[PDB]
Amino acid sequence: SWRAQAASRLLAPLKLPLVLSGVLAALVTLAQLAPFVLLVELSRLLVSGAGAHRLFTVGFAAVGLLGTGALLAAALTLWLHVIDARFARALRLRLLSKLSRLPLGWFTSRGSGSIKKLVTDDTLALHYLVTHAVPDAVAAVVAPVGVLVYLFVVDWRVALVLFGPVLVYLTITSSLTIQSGPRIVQAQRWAEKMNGEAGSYLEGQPVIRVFGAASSSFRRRLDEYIGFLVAWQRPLAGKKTLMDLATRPATFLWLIAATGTLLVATHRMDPVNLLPFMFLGTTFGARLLGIAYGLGGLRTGLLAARHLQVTLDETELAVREHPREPLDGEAPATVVFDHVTFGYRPGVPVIQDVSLTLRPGTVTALVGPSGSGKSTLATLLARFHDVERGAIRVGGQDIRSLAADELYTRVGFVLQEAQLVHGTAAENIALAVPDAPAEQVQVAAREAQIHDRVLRLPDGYDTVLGANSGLSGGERQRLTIARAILGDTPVLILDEATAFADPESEYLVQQALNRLTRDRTVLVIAHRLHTITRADQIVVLDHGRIVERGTHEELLAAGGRYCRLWDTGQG
Amino acid sequence: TWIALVPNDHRARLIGFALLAFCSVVARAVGTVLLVPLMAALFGEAPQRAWLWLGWLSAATVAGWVLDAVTARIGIELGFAVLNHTQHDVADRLPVVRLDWFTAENTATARQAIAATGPELVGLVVNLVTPLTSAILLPAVIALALLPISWQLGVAALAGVPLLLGALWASAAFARRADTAADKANTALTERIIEFARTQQALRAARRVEPARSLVGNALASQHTATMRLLGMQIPGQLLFSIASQLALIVLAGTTAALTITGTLTVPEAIALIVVMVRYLEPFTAVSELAPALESTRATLGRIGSVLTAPVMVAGSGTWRDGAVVPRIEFDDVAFGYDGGSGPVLDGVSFCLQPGTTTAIVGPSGCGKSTILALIAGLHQPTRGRVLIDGTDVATLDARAQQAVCSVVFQHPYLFHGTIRDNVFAADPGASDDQFAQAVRLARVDELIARLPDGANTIVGEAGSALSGGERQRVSIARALLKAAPVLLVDEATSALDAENEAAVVDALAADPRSRTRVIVAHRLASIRHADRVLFVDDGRVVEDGSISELLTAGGRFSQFWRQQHEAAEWQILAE
Ligand SMILES: Nc1ncnc2c1ncn2[C@@H]1O[C@H](COP(=O)(O)OP(=O)(O)NP(=O)(O)O)[C@@H](O)[C@H]1O
């Protein structure tokens, strides 16, 4: 059962540690019920005449129990932290070296909160599972089990009566858990519908303040939710009160008293044996309903342990194939897609047998409708994912047989997602060559039209860029374009949407790109097909494969899909 | 200071609930005090004399049943009303909270306060309020009934309520102060890994990924981990109440066992008091059990106080007397800032927009233009301002006249979950289906709905809805054109690829016959040849204004922008 599962493979080194922890936390919770066993021996000593010296030997035992139950708990709470700090430290060093090996496109399939939700929240849920949820789930089971065994050896006749309020409660609770078959998934669909509603209501605040009647939808979806909750709960109240009156200690006390009065008064009980039940038996319903509450604390720890183990299991980029043959014709810049096929999900292909061929020192544009597969086809060259069926090769060598440093020392890309690193503004312009004399860092920032904007910084080039720096997306982009100018990769992957993603700084980005895309092999993800009309080879494609191919002057002659995207208004 | 308080429907149906939850505790105290004559009789030589005291215990148990049943049936209806009255307060407060409050964290907080407070507001009075306030008064009422019986053990039990409650408050303060250091150290550890994953493409593409991994790795490997400080944090919060409760029992049972040896009590009734001392200590343990249930509730319902104590904007009386004509918008020494560390700054802006004129606002990115529009709309208040429209300061108007003056086309278009024709009718829900006929033939969305499967009644909230970002900015133009306020504030969308959304705003300006006073923050070039005066704004200050015949012949800050915008449109990626 507990095998070969995600949470079972992650939390594998903590087997003997957690076993010792459970053994030690069983004694800790057994040394807290032992005082009530000493109370029954103190009572017997009062009943049986003598004392005043034998009654100190019970107080000695009680203070010894206090001391040894404090020592045991203090030892457990530090074992459970020494043994958890080591696991967390060794698990962070695994996440750090898994991120460095995952395919790069993975990081785009996620967001920025989906990474924190796994690196911080899922590593804190494990810390809490180890330090709280496991020692609590052991006590929550050992306490009622020990009480029930101690009360049956004392007297089995009165310990049977304590099952009345348990059968009465379990009958009801099931009669109630099937009256909410629908409404326990209805209320889960409502809880995720009312979250998107809150998100939209918060995101559309400005509109709601200009047009007042735009919040009517939210305010009527909310009266439906807080009306559903009432119509769901208001029925099942005379059941939740009934099953609550059956676990109250005032209910167990009456049963114990009525059953003990019958046995003592008829001379078959020896009333010193009814005292264990008066001490430990009245709070016996709380323990049985705390069992489930203690076992339900492991769920939010095991979910985290599974979410971490699926990520640590994610298939990472292939190691590299045999450093095979450069296929006899391709110059160091020539790029060849050869029958590539690729799809994100294992049954839905997004690319079908595309076989284009770039050339050394030429431009090549990728036109097509939206969601056509041109962004995917572009980022397939940077090995954001691996191709399923075909094979790409830049320079004559399959990009699968290239080291991660030799690939990016030969293929560069300027997409969206600026991604400045934390550090000096000259530490970003010279990231791909960290020892640039700072004269090249200047001649390269004067070409990306970002030199006068960085001289207007507090320290100038030595300014430490951060989350808030005072740089718009169009001048954070001329930095990564300056960096890319120092890289000098002879093959560029240009996303043409980076030009017009910031309209103010849109003529300076175009002067930076005029310099970045010189004397090299460019591949443009075109969006506006009037910029790419002097490209050497334009390539059309519709939801997958390639349909038409050629220059613009010719491609305009043989009418279809290109004349149909061209004459569509603009012309 | 609203936190989670009760409704405003009644006051005699809320004070007779405390007098019921308090009698439900008197019943349990009487049920426990009735154990003294019963157990004192069971341990005597005539144990059949304990039937009289089981009769009275039955009488005291069947009464506690009724009192606990009514107190729960009422506590459920009081949870229903708390849910109803609280969810209608957050939703009534949010449209008045100041817009700069909605940061990235406050938006998450406020969306949790709406989406994730449902079931723990109904299950509050019956799950946390009565079980907690009953278990706190129970030992104090038990101690009071003992004074006629044994005053020594009664006084020793009054003395123990403050100590045992202090040991419960202190062991929770310790357990809470350590759990914050625990998730602060974890964050201080895993924020270099969060950065290493954020800037990943930049590293691998720069061939700098393995040295950065080495850096984060060695720092992580050492970090000293600061653990045993948190051990010292954690231990007292685990041991304090357990030690206190185990120590109170020893004292109370050695007091009872001593009053015997001397002769105060006899043994039978010294045991009846040891049985009562144990029952007196169970409420304290029950309070210790719903400590996590109280901390989770406190956290979850702190998000509601976060909203109900958020700063609200204040509006005057106003009554926009004669809005009719067309308003002459005027800024006067206006200066604005969300705060002063970083953000769109503005200071010294002062113009006067003649009534019934189209006015463009161009400039560097520096979006103190999306702020100049918000200051006119009323969405933001100036810090040294008096924005005044048609002569009268905006901040001196009640916020149903302060919004009945400006129609706005935002930058990022927002549509709520609903049909296409109810997003447009959100502007004027009483439009006479000809105002709807030409709010859509102006916005160029008549074709968009006469080319759509069911067209008009398409649900367009968020499903993808077949509507792209550029044609979702043609329904905002149709909404804004419907509402007939005498000010139109357009904030052009960065969206290219349009080929229709351009002519949309062009026709909105040049075609509409409603005769309002229009103000556009333009990025395109065709929507600037319709304005009759331009405002070039740099560094939060109008550097020049005028028509495009004197700006162009001024050869200054705007002729350069003109030239650049003309050259940034005939750009083409080339090999050469
Ligand atoms: N991370 C992803 N996981 C699964 N499917 C994806 C992912 N990213 C994109 N797709 C789908 O892959 C298909 C190709 O999309 P894409 O590669 O963006 O083509 P595109 O035309 O270049 N993008 P665009 O031009 O902006 O519409 C579409 O059906 C997308 O929805």
mmCIF file of N, CA, C and O in Angstrom, chain A residues 198 202, chain B residues 90 94 101-102 105-115 303 307:
data_model
loop_
_atom_site.group_PDB
_atom_site.id
_atom_site.type_symbol
_atom_site.label_atom_id
_atom_site.label_comp_id
_atom_site.label_asym_id
_atom_site.label_seq_id
_atom_site.Cartn_x
_atom_site.Cartn_y
_atom_site.Cartn_z
ATOM 1 N N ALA A 198 -14.109 36.938 -7.205
ATOM 2 C CA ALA A 198 -13.365 37.892 -6.395
ATOM 3 C C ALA A 198 -12.191 38.465 -7.170
ATOM 4 O O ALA A 198 -11.924 39.671 -7.106
ATOM 5 N N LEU A 202 -11.852 42.431 -8.097
ATOM 6 C CA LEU A 202 -10.725 43.224 -7.627
ATOM 7 C C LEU A 202 -9.944 43.811 -8.788
ATOM 8 O O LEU A 202 -9.472 44.949 -8.714
ATOM 9 N N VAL B 90 -17.685 43.803 3.166
ATOM 10 C CA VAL B 90 -16.508 43.827 2.312
ATOM 11 C C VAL B 90 -16.869 44.310 0.917
ATOM 12 O O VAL B 90 -16.161 45.140 0.335
ATOM 13 N N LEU B 94 -15.210 47.781 -0.587
ATOM 14 C CA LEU B 94 -14.202 47.736 -1.638
ATOM 15 C C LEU B 94 -14.352 48.832 -2.691
ATOM 16 O O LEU B 94 -13.335 49.371 -3.138
ATOM 17 N N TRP B 101 -4.300 51.506 -2.686
ATOM 18 C CA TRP B 101 -4.228 50.464 -1.671
ATOM 19 C C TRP B 101 -4.095 49.092 -2.310
ATOM 20 O O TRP B 101 -3.519 48.178 -1.712
ATOM 21 N N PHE B 102 -4.611 48.929 -3.524
ATOM 22 C CA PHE B 102 -4.693 47.620 -4.164
ATOM 23 C C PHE B 102 -3.338 47.253 -4.754
ATOM 24 O O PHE B 102 -3.147 47.171 -5.969
ATOM 25 N N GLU B 105 0.024 42.541 -2.748
ATOM 26 C CA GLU B 105 -0.310 41.753 -1.568
ATOM 27 C C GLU B 105 -1.727 42.037 -1.090
ATOM 28 O O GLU B 105 -2.444 41.114 -0.689
ATOM 29 N N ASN B 106 -2.143 43.302 -1.118
ATOM 30 C CA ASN B 106 -3.477 43.668 -0.676
ATOM 31 C C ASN B 106 -4.561 43.110 -1.576
ATOM 32 O O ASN B 106 -5.640 42.790 -1.082
ATOM 33 N N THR B 107 -4.300 42.963 -2.867
ATOM 34 C CA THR B 107 -5.249 42.297 -3.743
ATOM 35 C C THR B 107 -5.429 40.828 -3.396
ATOM 36 O O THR B 107 -6.567 40.347 -3.374
ATOM 37 N N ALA B 108 -4.345 40.109 -3.110
ATOM 38 C CA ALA B 108 -4.475 38.726 -2.667
ATOM 39 C C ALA B 108 -5.226 38.647 -1.348
ATOM 40 O O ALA B 108 -6.113 37.804 -1.176
ATOM 41 N N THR B 109 -4.885 39.525 -0.405
ATOM 42 C CA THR B 109 -5.582 39.555 0.875
ATOM 43 C C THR B 109 -7.074 39.776 0.683
ATOM 44 O O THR B 109 -7.901 39.054 1.251
ATOM 45 N N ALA B 110 -7.438 40.767 -0.126
ATOM 46 C CA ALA B 110 -8.835 41.101 -0.327
ATOM 47 C C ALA B 110 -9.587 40.040 -1.105
ATOM 48 O O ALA B 110 -10.787 39.871 -0.881
ATOM 49 N N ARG B 111 -8.932 39.320 -2.009
ATOM 50 C CA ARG B 111 -9.633 38.241 -2.681
ATOM 51 C C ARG B 111 -9.806 37.028 -1.787
ATOM 52 O O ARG B 111 -10.815 36.325 -1.913
ATOM 53 N N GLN B 112 -8.869 36.778 -0.871
ATOM 54 C CA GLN B 112 -9.101 35.751 0.134
ATOM 55 C C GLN B 112 -10.242 36.133 1.061
ATOM 56 O O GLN B 112 -11.061 35.279 1.408
ATOM 57 N N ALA B 113 -10.321 37.407 1.445
ATOM 58 C CA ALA B 113 -11.378 37.862 2.337
ATOM 59 C C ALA B 113 -12.767 37.675 1.749
ATOM 60 O O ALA B 113 -13.746 37.699 2.498
ATOM 61 N N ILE B 114 -12.882 37.496 0.439
ATOM 62 C CA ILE B 114 -14.168 37.270 -0.199
ATOM 63 C C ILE B 114 -14.373 35.803 -0.543
ATOM 64 O O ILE B 114 -15.461 35.264 -0.345
ATOM 65 N N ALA B 115 -13.341 35.141 -1.051
ATOM 66 C CA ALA B 115 -13.505 33.798 -1.576
ATOM 67 C C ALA B 115 -13.329 32.706 -0.535
ATOM 68 O O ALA B 115 -13.902 31.625 -0.696
ATOM 69 N N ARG B 303 -7.923 38.840 7.580
ATOM 70 C CA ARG B 303 -8.049 39.362 6.229
ATOM 71 C C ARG B 303 -9.302 40.197 6.043
ATOM 72 O O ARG B 303 -9.369 40.985 5.098
ATOM 73 N N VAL B 307 -9.392 44.506 5.237
ATOM 74 C CA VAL B 307 -10.200 45.239 4.274
ATOM 75 C C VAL B 307 -11.016 46.321 4.963
ATOM 76 O O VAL B 307 -11.097 47.457 4.488
#
